[PDB]
Design a protein around this ligand. Structure first.
Ligand SMILES: NC(=O)c1cccnc1
Length: 246
C-alpha cells in the first residue's frame, strides 16, 4: 500500500510518493524510457494496486489503479468502494473485495468526467488543498456525482498523470512547495491528451523516428511537432503505455 498524506506535505514527500508509484508501475524499459507492463503477458493477480490518500490518521481513502495503463479504476472509503463505469471486469475481483462495491454512473475518461463535473480540466484547480478537499468529500460519502467527477479529475492528474509525466509531477511539486493552487496549462493538457501517441511513437520508432508525428501544444498554445526520441519534450515521459516491443 503506497501512501501519500496531505498533512504537512512537502515537495519532497510528494516527490517520494510519485517515485514509489513509478517504481511499482514500471514493467520495463524501451529505448531507456520506462514502460508499463504488456497487458497480454501480465498475471491478473499483479494487475491492480492500491494507493492510500490521507488527510490525517483518522481521515483517508484508497484509490485502485490498473497497472496496465495507470488508470484510477475505483476508490474506497471505509466499508464502501466505488468503481468507474468502464472499470475492467477483473478490477472488482482484486480491488476492495472486502467492501460493498458500487458502480459509478460515469466512465473514467476525461470526456465523461468533465461532462459530469460541468467543468473542463482547464477550469478545475489542482494542488494540496484541492486534493485535501477531495479526500474529505470521498470519505464523507456525499452522493453529489458532479463533485465525485471533479474530485476524480483532481486525483487522476495529481496521481496518474504525475506518474506518467515529469512535467506534471514537478508542477504539482511546485504547487505544494509554494502553497499555490494551479490550473493545468496547455502544455500539461496536451501531454495528457497525447500519452498514448507519445508512447506509440517511441516504441514503434525506427532510426529514432516515430512512424507517425505526434503534435503537442507548448505553454503559449503553439504546436510543437514531435517525431523522434531525441526531441527535448520526449525527456518528460516518465512512464509509457505499452504499445509494442521494438
Ligand atoms: N481514470 C483515469 O485514471 C484516467 C482517465 C483519463 C486519463 N488518464 C487517467
Amino acid at each position: 500500500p503506497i501512501k501519500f498524506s496531505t498533512e504537512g506535505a512537502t515537495s519532497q514527500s510528494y516527490k517520494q510518493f510519485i517515485e514509489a508509484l513509478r517504481e511499482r508501475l514500471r514493467g520495463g524499459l524501451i529505448h531507456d524510457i520506462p514502460v508499463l507492463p504488456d497487458p497480454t503477458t501480465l498475471q491478473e493477480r499483479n494487475r491492480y494496486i492500491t494507493v492510500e490518500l490521507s488527510n490525517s490518521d483518522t481521515e483517508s481513502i484508497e484509490v485502485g489503479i490498473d497497472v496496465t495503463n495507470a488508470y484510477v479504476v475505483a476508490y474506497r472509503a471505509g466499508t464502501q468502494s466505488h468503481f468507474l463505469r468502464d472499470a475492467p471486469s477483473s478490477a472488482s475481483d482484486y480491488l476492495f473485495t472486502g467492501t460493498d462495491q458500487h458502480s459509478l454512473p460515469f466512465y473514467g475518461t476525461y470526456g465523461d468526467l468533465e461532462r459530469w463535473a460541468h467543468q473542463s480540466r482547464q477550469q478545475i484547480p489542482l494542488g494540496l488543498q484541492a486534493l485535501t478537499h477531495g479526500i474529505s468529500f470521498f470519505r464523507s460519502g456525499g452522493n453529489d456525482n458532479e463533485e465525485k467527477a471533479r474530485t476524480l479529475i483532481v486525483i487522476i492528474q495529481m496521481v496518474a498523470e504525475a506518474a506518467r509525466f515529469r512535467y506534471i509531477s514537478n508542477r504539482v511539486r511546485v504547487s505544494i512547495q509554494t502553497g499555490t493552487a494551479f490550473q493545468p496549462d496547455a502544455a500539461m493538457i496536451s501531454l495528457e491528451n497525447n500519452w498514448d501517441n507519445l508512447s506509440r511513437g517511441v516504441q514503434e520508432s525506427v532510426q529514432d523516428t516515430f512512424p507517425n508525428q505526434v503534435t503537442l501544444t507548448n505553454i503559449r498554445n503553439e504546436p510543437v511537432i514531435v517525431d523522434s526520441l531525441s526531441h527535448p519534450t520526449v525527456a518528460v515521459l516518465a512512464l509509457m503505455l505499452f504499445v509494442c516491443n521494438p
